[PDB]
Each structure stands twice: as structure tokens, then as C-alpha cells.
């Protein structure tokens, strides 16, 4: 051909068929999927829909509050950074022999969100009892229409795939109880979540409301000065998010104490080191809160490390990792004709107006 | 043919266009060279000038004679229809004039427009994906109908 730059791969145009993606027994061929998606290859739409809906069916049978025992690798926000998700599994261990808990935010910001969803859903189908996925605040209609996931689905697949994802996201569990020690959630606590039963009783099968316990689980944050508070308001309006709350160190410690838990593991906030351990509880001598953030060099500019938390043999091993190369996209997945045509029009008009004076 | 029959222009318009052509033809050769266009400061930082000249130059001799000039500017008459504008836009990208936009042409023409605003590797990636999404018949190039399907609604 006359293609100028061979220093980058040319993505495959072939869309993988059901026969190529699923073995005779209905098992996803995750190695083929990984390789094809890493090449920016697409699936046939019907195949993508099958992965999403089969995953949803499994998620739908799970409880709001999962029980997950160690050993397990716990992961925070991914935000569509598919090429970093690939490194994440190398750092955390192969899902074929490693239990996983993801704390949500699979989509938005990164422009490989649908690849993240398809691959994780395929892994869920293959490893339904060892790979676990929680809901984050981005796994909803409201945020995905504001950010880029809906457009991503439109350009790569169609709104049918988007809608399937929205239903699947409604099915995502909200929390895990890990080793009967750790409450794991995307965001944090709620003034309406005082025991674990308060999570168990929720109806999660919906778009998250703008208020209430389900909202708070996905949306809340620790105070900026968590552990060094000047007042003792347990929950205050979250002026950063515009909804839900900031929770205080006394709020967390009282909850942990009451429910005989060791710590809260959550995600939802970028961390330069990929993690943050907050002040030890006065009743456990262990950090009251840990944030895990699994998206290295977030937005391609934060220059943060990512981390996962591997809990095994009574050791919590925080494993940091750095970013991996990924392909380029114009903002909002704009094609180069749509991008350049206005400039063409402006410059050609410019030229001729001046030629004709 | 009289030029008003080869364009959207009437005789009055042709005469005015003639007066501007003469002013631009510095050596009275009867043709405009690229250098003669570039003598206009306003065309200075304009990456499209080369492409427009090439499109106007229908006999491919590297210069624009008066008939080529008239027929070229005609493609921007207010009296030209939507299809003519889409055809001109397509011609911006179709460097070798074979009626298809190839991968290499799309890259080269965008590179003229973007300069160093994107690395070659970045530009190649977005060219590739534009073609994969727009190429309905799988020949790895973009036909006029494939192009229009992408940009037809932009107006």
C-alpha cells in the first residue's frame, strides 16, 4: 500500500465471531480476546452483546455484599486504561489462579473503556467464583453520557452495546466483606449505613439515585484532613462531588468498632503513589482507611503510580506499577475528516477571499 | 466554450476575475505559478494553498491558466450546490486524483494541515481508525460515497 508510518501497528478490521471467541462449551477464549483487543480489534456486535449479557446474568445472582476470602488481589479505578489493565494482571497474578476484587470505575476518561468491560466480563464468565467486580460511580447512565463511554460505544459498536452495559452495571454488587475483616466499597460510608445489614437490604438494581445509601457507597470521600479534624461532624456535604458526603476519621472508627471490622478499603480518588493508608484506628492499631487507585499516569498527565493490594498469608502487599503505551485517539473519538474539514473550509475560504480581494 | 458556460459566472464576473488574474500574473506568462500565489502575504501561513492550486491545475502542468482559474474559483460560487462543495472537499484529500482517498494521501494531507501538532505515529493511528470505520467495502481506501457518509451532515 502507500501507508506512510509502519512504526505503529495497523489494527485488524475483522470482527471476531462467536466461533472465534467462545469454545464449544461456551467458555470465552480470553487469550484470543486479550490479543485482539490489545490490537484495537473489535468483536461482532452480537458477540459483544453476548459477553455483556452473560456476565450480567452472573452478576445478577450475586449478593449486594460479597463474601471474598484471601488470598485476593484488590484493585481500584481503571477508567478505561485497557493497556494498564494488562499490566495490572501481570502485577496482581493471573486470574486463572488468583482471586480478584475490583472496586469499580471501569469506564470513562480512558478511551478503551469498552475493551476493559468486555475483557473483565469475559473473565467473570470464565472465573465466576474467583473474579469479582463492584460498582463504581461511573458505572451508570448519568456519568457515561456526560463523559465519553456512551460515545465510545456509539463509534466502536452501537448504542445497543451501551444499553447492555447499563443493564449489566445495574447488576454490579455494591460491596465486599473480605476475610471477615475488611469492608470494600468504591467510595465509602454513609450516614445511613451503620451496619453491614444496611448494605444487604438495599435494592441495587437501578441507576444510582442522587441521594441516599446507594449513592453514598459509590460517591463519598474521606475529608481532606481525615485524621486531623478540627470539628467532629461525622458526615458533611461533599462540596467536591456536589452530592453525598465527606466522612471523618471518627465516623470511620466508630463504624469499624461497632461492626468489628479492621479497615475500609476503597478507591474513587487518584493517588500519586497509587495508594494511601490513613490514620490508624484507636481500637485496632491498623489504618482505618485505605485508598487504592489502579490507573497509572491518569488522564495521560497525572504522572501517578498505580497500585493493587494483594492480601495473602496475613500480609497486605501493596504493589505499585507504572503506565504502559497506548494508541492515540482524537478527543471524543472524532474521525480525521470531521476534525479537519472545518479547518479546510476556513483556509480555502481565506485563500480565495484574498486571491480575489 | 465561453467561460460563463463552464462556470457559475456571468460575463461581468468573468471580466472582473480577469482583472484580478492579470494582477497576480507577475510575468505576463498567462499562467499563475505557485510562487505568484505566494507573493500574497495573506496566503503565507496557509497549508491548504498547495492543495487548492493542485486541484485548480486540471491539466497538471503545475500552473493555473485563466480557464483553470475561473473553473477553480467557480467551485466556491454561492450558486454551487452541496454536491459540488462535497466534491471539492474530497479533492482536497485525493492527491493523485484517482477518485479514492488512500491511507497515504489522508496522512500526507492531514500532515500538511497539522504540521508538528501531532507526531507521525499519533497521526497514523487516527488515520488508520478513521479508514477502518469509514471503509464499507474493505478495499482500504475511501470512496466519494464513503466520504460523504462521514461528513455529509456537517454542512
Amino acid at each position: 500500500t502507500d501507508r506512510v508510518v509502519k512504526a505503529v501497528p495497523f489494527p485488524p478490521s475483522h470482527r471476531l465471531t462467536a466461533k472465534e471467541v467462545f469454545d464449544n462449551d461456551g467458555k470465552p477464549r480470553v487469550d484470543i480476546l486479550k490479543a485482539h483487543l490489545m490490537k484495537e480489534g473489535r468483536l461482532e456486535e452480537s458477540v459483544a452483546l453476548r459477553i455483556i449479557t452473560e456476565g450480567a446474568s452472573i452478576l445478577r445472582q450475586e449478593k449486594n455484599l460479597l463474601d471474598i476470602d484471601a488470598p485476593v488481589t484488590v484493585c481500584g479505578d481503571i477508567h478505561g486504561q485497557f493497556f494498564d489493565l494488562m499490566k495490572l494482571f501481570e502485577v496482581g497474578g493471573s486470574p486463572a489462579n488468583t482471586r480478584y476484587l475490583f472496586l469499580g470505575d471501569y469506564v470513562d476518561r480512558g478511551y478503551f473503556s469498552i475493551e476493559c468491560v468486555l475483557y473483565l466480563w469475559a473473565l467473570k464468565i470464565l472465573y465466576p467464583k474467583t473474579l469479582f467486580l463492584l460498582r463504581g460511580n461511573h458505572e451508570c447512565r448519568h456519568l457515561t453520557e456526560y463523559f465519553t463511554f456512551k460515545q465510545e460505544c456509539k463509534i466502536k459498536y452501537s448504542e445497543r452495546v451501551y444499553d447492555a452495559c447499563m443493564d449489566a452495571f445495574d447488576c454490579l454488587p455494591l460491596a465486599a466483606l473480605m476475610n471477615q475483616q475488611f469492608l470494600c466499597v468504591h467510595g465509602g460510608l454513609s450516614p445511613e449505613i451503620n451496619t453491614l445489614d444496611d448494605i444487604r437490604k438495599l435494592d441495587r438494581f437501578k441507576e444510582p439515585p442522587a441521594y441516599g445509601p446507594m449513592c453514598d457507597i459509590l460517591w463519598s470521600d474521606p475529608l481532606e484532613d481525615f485524621g486531623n479534624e478540627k470539628t467532629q461532624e461525622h458526615f458533611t456535604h461533599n462540596t467536591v462531588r456536589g452530592c453525598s458526603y465527606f466522612y471523618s476519621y471518627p465516623a470511620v472508627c466508630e463504624f469499624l468498632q461497632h461492626n468489628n471490622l479492621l479497615s475500609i478499603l476503597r478507591a474513587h480518588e487518584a493517588q500519586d503513589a497509587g495508594y494511601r493508608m490513613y490514620r490508624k484506628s484507636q481500637t485496632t492499631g491498623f489504618p482505618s482507611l485505605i485508598t487504592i487507585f489502579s490507573a497509572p499516569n491518569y488522564l495521560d498527565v497525572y504522572n501517578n503510580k498505580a497500585a493493587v493490594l494483594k492480601y495473602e498469608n496475613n500480609v497486605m502487599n501493596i504493589r505499585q506499577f507504572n503506565c504502559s503505551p497506548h494508541p492515540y485517539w482524537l478527543p471524543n473519538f472524532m474521525d480525521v475528516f470531521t476534525w479537519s474539514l472545518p479547518f479546510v473550509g476556513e483556509k480555502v475560504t481565506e485563500m480565495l477571499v484574498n486571491v480575489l480581494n | 466554450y465561453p467561460l460563463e458556460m463552464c462556470s457559475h459566472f456571468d460575463a461581468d464576473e468573468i471580466k472582473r476575475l480577469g482583472k484580478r488574474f492579470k494582477k497576480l500574473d507577475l510575468d505576463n506568462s498567462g499562467s499563475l505559478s505557485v510562487e505568484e500565489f505566494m507573493s500574497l502575504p495573506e496566503l503565507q501561513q496557509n497549508p491548504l494553498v498547495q492543495r487548492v492550486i493542485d486541484i485548480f491545475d486540471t491539466d497538471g502542468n503545475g500552473e493555473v491558466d485563466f480557464k483553470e482559474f475561473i473553473e477553480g474559483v467557480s467551485q466556491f460560487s454561492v450558486k454551487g450546490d452541496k454536491e459540488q462543495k462535497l466534491r471539492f472537499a474530497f479533492r482536497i484529500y485525493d492527491m493523485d486524483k484517482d477518485g479514492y482517498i488512500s491511507n497515504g494521501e489522508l496522512f500526507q494531507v492531514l500532515k500538511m494541515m497539522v504540521g508538528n501538532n501531532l507526531k507521525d505515529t499519533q497521526l497514523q493511528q487516527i488515520v488508520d481508525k478513521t479508514i477502518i470505520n469509514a471503509d464499507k467495502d474493505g478495499d482500504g481506501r475511501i470512496s466519494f460515497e464513503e466520504f460523504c457518509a462521514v461528513v455529509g451532515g456537517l454542512d
Binding site: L262, V315, P331 | P47, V114, G115
Partner: peptide
């Protein structure tokens, strides 16, 4: 009570978008 252990990594290495010259076709800022 679990033991905490941090495992480190190297710094990020990545390409930055070129500065956008407004005389040419630009990528809109995100």
C-alpha cells in the same frame, strides 16, 4: 493483624502531546 509491605516500581515513561500551534490544525484541549 496483617503485616503491611510496599513493593515499588520504576517511574512512568510516556509521550506528551505536542504544544498546539494555532496556525495549524489543532487538537482541542480536553
Amino acid at each position: 493483624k496483617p503485616k503491611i509491605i510496599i513493593t515499588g516500581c520504576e517511574d512512568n515513561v510516556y509521550e506528551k502531546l505536542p504544544e498546539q500551534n494555532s496556525n495549524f490544525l489543532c487538537v482541542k484541549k480536553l
